[PDB]
RNA sequence: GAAUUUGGACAAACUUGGUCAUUUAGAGGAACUAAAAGUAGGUUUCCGUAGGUGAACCUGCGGAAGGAUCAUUA
RNA sequence: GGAUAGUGGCCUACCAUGGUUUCAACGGGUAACGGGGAAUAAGGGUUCGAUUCCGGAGAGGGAGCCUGAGAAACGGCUACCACAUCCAAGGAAGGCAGCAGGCGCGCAAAUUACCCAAUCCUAAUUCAGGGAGGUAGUGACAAUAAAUAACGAUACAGGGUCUUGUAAUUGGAAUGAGUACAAUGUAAAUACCUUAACGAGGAACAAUUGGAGGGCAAGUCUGGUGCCAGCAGCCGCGGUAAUUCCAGCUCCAAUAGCGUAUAUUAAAGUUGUUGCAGUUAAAAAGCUCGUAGUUGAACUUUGGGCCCGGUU
């Protein structure tokens, strides 16, 4: 009799599963961003469809309606603060013009690759998963962190994670011990 | 028979991207996906 | 025009005419008469379990034939007798007499599929283990 | 008569103007084995 | 103030005969199934009704085309 | 009038003959507890709602009753019916649709564990109790995040002095799945968060489930078995209503998930109010009258001027 815990699924599979154009576009996106499967594309498409539905039934509402003003301004503020929507496109017909790779650009994996420090997208994903990147002072090991605009200057190496100093890792430690006991004396 | 194992997960998708369109390997002019003895 | 009443105070005739016409459905009449709970070989169930009464040497043609056989089985809860297409060949040596098989449908939401006239069930499990694992030499059929 | 049926219906989309994969020794067989 | 007792309302249940509901035997019948393997004919098509007949079918009355408009006068 | 806590045919004595119904009464069925809600996305609808909240009803089936503010109570009593336990054979004692757990029925569902530490409840009451509740065990019901690899150097191959690929070539990096001092955690523990030490070179620490004429994305692959009054003659070829008879290779999709069965929803304008159809494809009563029902011509204060002040 405990109060129920609400859950919800955050992706939706396409209605027509075998068509060549959508499949090749999905593989294009997965190759250029370095994705594990198609579920990331489905997740972005699902939440973008949610955003587009909200924008549509606010644009159907009459102008100067207080609900339209409040929800539209909140939606534009949120999608600028995330960083997907540009600074010069703060309108509703312009948030209807959003695309999937615009959302996929703002991932931590793509943002840690594009800011140097990774030299590849798959190297960026491997570098993130192995707990090497901290936003501010918080270590993040998730490729889909969706970096804000205000923290773009804070993606750096962790205070842990030997690429940022602080006591090099296990393989180098074992190699140093091997060279010390064998080539030392 | 035994073969070197195929990569699993994300790298496999990466492989397909490398297989499909970076330096496209095998085409008959109309982008065949499964050739035999040419 | 267009046959139907259209006036504003005329919802009752629309209601009753729709109810009679809906009684001329196929799914509505099969659902509201309780046809599956009284007349179907299953009790409206997704799967069922049964006792293998007989196996018959049903081939597609004569000696140059395709080995595609079926068994005749009797249900546990209903007591009715049906017939079931067993899977791919090599499974006939697994299914002996009195094996307590578990059955499903064949794929037409309650009708026969395939070139076998009058068979709409498949033997999903035998002796409480499987057919897929038993045919792939992964698990073995328990004795008795 | 599966192979004969596939070959008979195989020629219609040539008449109706649609692409058809060219035939070989894989047509009238169980491509994927059953359970 | 207990054991016990009269009458009343509440009323489980029991016996008899009747009503209804579901299922299993039971002669006989009509239908059908794969049954590989049993005993040339006429050809308008129907509808309603009535009689006859191993099988469709045959005949009587009334209706329909869901049947192939030539030619000539004016 | 009686009865009730109280209105009341709730019951009794008397007297009237009334009350409901085609706007569907009454009777039957319901694999029917009702609602908040759930699934399905152009809408309107369609299907589901035993089940975390609210209300009702029941404690094996009926009936009756005591105590009490409150019960027709069943972890209270009494009787009957049906089950069923113990024996010294005289008698006694029952009620898990509370929590665990057993049989049974089935396609179909978990521990005879720990604790009142939290949330609250009861009591004479800060203290006791609570299978209410919480915690852990089983648990791929469903839901969320994302490991199974990354960077070079060599030798060639290209677009061609900068950019990618191949290989029984080679090099060092990095990290958690795990093994665990410790400490956090907790009523006490398990686990998560943190971390001393150990922990990767491929048959390691190896990902599966489905499918390939078309539907629908993916083969002008390979081998074996069986038959032929067809050619050859012991090599073989071709055909094989073998609906491929059996295996392997290659390729495609989804991916810690994938397949199958049943039901339902969408596509479905095959229920059509929106929104079907009726000469010939399913379907206009043989025709007319006619009650309910549905629907029903036009007309009745319009126009003009006055000011003020609201929103762009």
Swiss-Prot record, chain A:
InterPro entries tied to this protein: Ribosomal_uS4 (IPR022801), Ribosomal_uS4_CS (IPR018079), Ribosomal_uS4_euk/arc (IPR005710), Ribosomal_uS4_N (IPR001912), S4_RNA-bd (IPR002942), S4_RNA-bd_sf (IPR036986)
Cited PROSITE patterns: RIBOSOMAL_S4, S4
Domain of life: Eukaryota
Alphabetized GO MF terms: rRNA binding; structural constituent of ribosome
GO biological process: maturation of SSU-rRNA from tricistronic rRNA transcript (SSU-rRNA, 5.8S rRNA, LSU-rRNA); ribosomal small subunit biogenesis; translation
Name of this protein: Small ribosomal subunit protein uS4A
Self-association and partners: Component of the small ribosomal subunit (SSU). Mature yeast ribosomes consist of a small (40S) and a large (60S) subunit. The 40S small subunit contains 1 molecule of ribosomal RNA (18S rRNA) and 33 different proteins (encoded by 57 genes). The large 60S subunit contains 3 rRNA molecules (25S, 5.8S and 5S rRNA) and 46 different proteins (encoded by 81 genes). Interacts with snoRNA U3. uS11 interacts with MPP10. Component of the ribosomal small subunit (SSU) processome composed of at least 40 protein subunits and snoRNA U3.
Organism of derivation: Saccharomyces cerevisiae (strain ATCC 204508 / S288c) (Baker's yeast)
Family to which the UniProt record says this protein belongs: Belongs to the universal ribosomal protein uS4 family.
Miscellaneous notes: Present with 106000 molecules/cell in log phase SD medium.
Family matches, as SUPFAM superfamilies: Alpha-L RNA-binding motif
List of residues that carry Phosphoserine: 183
Residue segments, region Disordered: 159-185
One cellular component (GO) term of this entry: nucleolus
Keyword Ubl conjugation among record annotations: yes
UniProt-annotated location(s): Cytoplasm; Nucleus, Nucleolus
Gene3D superfamilies in the cross-refs: RNA-binding S4 domain (3.10.290.10)
Cross-link (Glycyl lysine isopeptide (Lys-Gly) (interchain with G-Cter in ubiquitin)): 179
Record-annotated S4 RNA-binding domain positions: 106-180
From Swiss-Prot, chain B:
Molecular function terms, GO-annotated: structural constituent of ribosome
Phosphothreonine PTM sites in chain numbering: 25
One example of a Gene Ontology biological process annotation: cytoplasmic translation
Key words, A-Z: Cytoplasm, Phosphoprotein, Ribonucleoprotein, Ribosomal protein
A Gene Ontology cellular-component term: cytoplasmic stress granule
Signal peptide annotation: none
Subcellular location: Cytoplasm
Subunit structure: Component of the small ribosomal subunit (SSU). Mature yeast ribosomes consist of a small (40S) and a large (60S) subunit. The 40S small subunit contains 1 molecule of ribosomal RNA (18S rRNA) and 33 different proteins (encoded by 57 genes). The large 60S subunit contains 3 rRNA molecules (25S, 5.8S and 5S rRNA) and 46 different proteins (encoded by 81 genes).
Its job: Component of the ribosome, a large ribonucleoprotein complex responsible for the synthesis of proteins in the cell. The small ribosomal subunit (SSU) binds messenger RNAs (mRNAs) and translates the encoded message by selecting cognate aminoacyl-transfer RNA (tRNA) molecules. The large subunit (LSU) contains the ribosomal catalytic site termed the peptidyl transferase center (PTC), which catalyzes the formation of peptide bonds, thereby polymerizing the amino acids delivered by tRNAs into a polypeptide chain.
Additional note from the record: Present with 37600 molecules/cell in log phase SD medium.
Protein name according to UniProt: Small ribosomal subunit protein eS30A
Source organism of the structure: Saccharomyces cerevisiae (strain ATCC 204508 / S288c)
Swiss-Prot record, chain C:
Cross-link named Glycyl lysine isopeptide (Lys-Gly) (interchain with G-Cter in ubiquitin), sites: 55
Subcellular location field: Cytoplasm
Biological-process GO terms, alphabetical: maintenance of translational fidelity; maturation of SSU-rRNA from tricistronic rRNA transcript (SSU-rRNA, 5.8S rRNA, LSU-rRNA); regulation of translational fidelity; translation
The keyword Ubl conjugation is annotated on this UniProt entry: yes
InterPro entries xrefs: NA-bd_OB-fold, Ribosomal_uS12, Ribosomal_uS12_euk/arc
Highest taxon in the source lineage: Eukaryota
Record's comment on post-translational modification: Hydroxylation at Pro-63 affects translation termination efficiency. The stereochemistry of the 3,4-dihydroxyproline has not yet been determined.
Any further remark recorded for this protein: Present with 10600 molecules/cell in log phase SD medium.
Quaternary structure and partners: Component of the small ribosomal subunit (SSU). Mature yeast ribosomes consist of a small (40S) and a large (60S) subunit. The 40S small subunit contains 1 molecule of ribosomal RNA (18S rRNA) and 33 different proteins (encoded by 57 genes). The large 60S subunit contains 3 rRNA molecules (25S, 5.8S and 5S rRNA) and 46 different proteins (encoded by 81 genes).
Family: Belongs to the universal ribosomal protein uS12 family.
Protein name listed in UniProt: Small ribosomal subunit protein uS12A
Organism, scientific name: Saccharomyces cerevisiae (strain ATCC 204508 / S288c) (Baker's yeast)
Curated annotation (Swiss-Prot), chain D:
Transmembrane segments: none
Subcellular location: Cytoplasm; Nucleus
Region feature (Disordered): 16-35
Motif Nuclear localization signal, residue numbers: 17-24
Superkingdom to which the source organism belongs: Eukaryota
Subunit structure: Interacts with TRM112. Interacts with ECM16.
Other known facts: Present with 1620 molecules/cell in log phase SD medium.
Purpose: S-adenosyl-L-methionine-dependent methyltransferase that specifically methylates the N(7) position of guanine 1575 (m7G1575) in 18S rRNA. Requires the methyltransferase adapter protein TRM112 for full rRNA methyltransferase activity. Important for biogenesis end export of the 40S ribosomal subunit independent on its methyltransferase activity. Required for efficient cleavage of the primary 35S precursor rRNA at site A2. Involved in positioning the proximal bud pole signal.
Family: Belongs to the class I-like SAM-binding methyltransferase superfamily. BUD23/WBSCR22 family.
Protein name: 18S rRNA (guanine(1575)-N(7))-methyltransferase
Full-sequence range covered: 241 to 275 of 275
């Amino acid at each position: 009799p405990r109060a129920p815990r609400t859950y919800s699924k955050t992706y939706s599979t396409p209605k027509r599963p075998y068509e060549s154009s959508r499949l090749d576009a999905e593989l294009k996106l997965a190759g250029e961003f370095g994705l594990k499967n198609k579920k990331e594309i489905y997740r972005i498409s699902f939440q973008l469809s949610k955003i587009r539905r909200a924008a549509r039934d606010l644009l159907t509402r009459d102008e100067k309606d207080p609900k339209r003003l409040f929800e539209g301004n909140a939606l534009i503020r949120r999608l600028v603060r995330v960083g997907v929507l540009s600074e010069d496109k703060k309108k509703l017909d312009y948030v209807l013009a959003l695309k999937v790779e615009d959302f996929l650009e703002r991932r931590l994996q793509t943002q840690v690759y594009k800011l140097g420090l990774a030299k590849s997208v798959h190297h960026a994903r491997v570098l993130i998963t192995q707990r090497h990147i901290a936003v501010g002072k918080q270590i993040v090991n998730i490729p889909s962190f969706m970096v804000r605009l205000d923290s773009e200057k804070h993606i750096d190496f962790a205070p842990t994670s030997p690429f940022g100093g602080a006591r090099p890792g296990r393989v180098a430690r074992r190699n140093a011990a091997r060279k010390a006991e064998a080539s030392g004396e | 028979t035994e073969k070197p194992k195929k990569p699993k997960g994300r790298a496999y998708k990466r492989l397909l991207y490398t297989r499909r369109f970076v330096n496209v390997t095998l085409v008959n002019g109309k982008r065949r996906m499964n050739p035999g003895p040419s | 025009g267009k046959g139907k009443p259209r006036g504003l105070n005329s919802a009752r005739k629309l209601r009753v005419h729709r109810r009679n016409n809906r009684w001329a459905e196929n799914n509505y009449k099969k659902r509201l008469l309780g046809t599956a709970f009284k007349s179907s070989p299953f009790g409206g169930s997704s799967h069922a379990k049964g006792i293998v009464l007989e196996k018959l040497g049903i081939e597609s043609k004569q000696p140059n034939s395709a080995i595609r056989k079926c068994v005749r089985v009797q249900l546990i809860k209903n007591g009715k007798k049906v017939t079931a297409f067993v899977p791919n060949d090599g499974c006939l040596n697994f299914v002996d007499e009195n094996d307590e098989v578990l059955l499903a449908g064949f794929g037409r939401k309650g009708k026969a599929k395939g070139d076998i006239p009058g068979v709409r069930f498949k033997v999903v499990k035998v002796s409480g283990v499987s057919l897929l694992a038993l045919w792939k030499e992964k698990k073995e059929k328990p004795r008795s | 008569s599966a192979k004969s049926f596939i070959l008979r219906k195989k020629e219609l989309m040539k008449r109706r103007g649609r692409k058809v994969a060219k035939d070989s020794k894989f047509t009238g067989r169980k491509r994927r084995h059953r359970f």
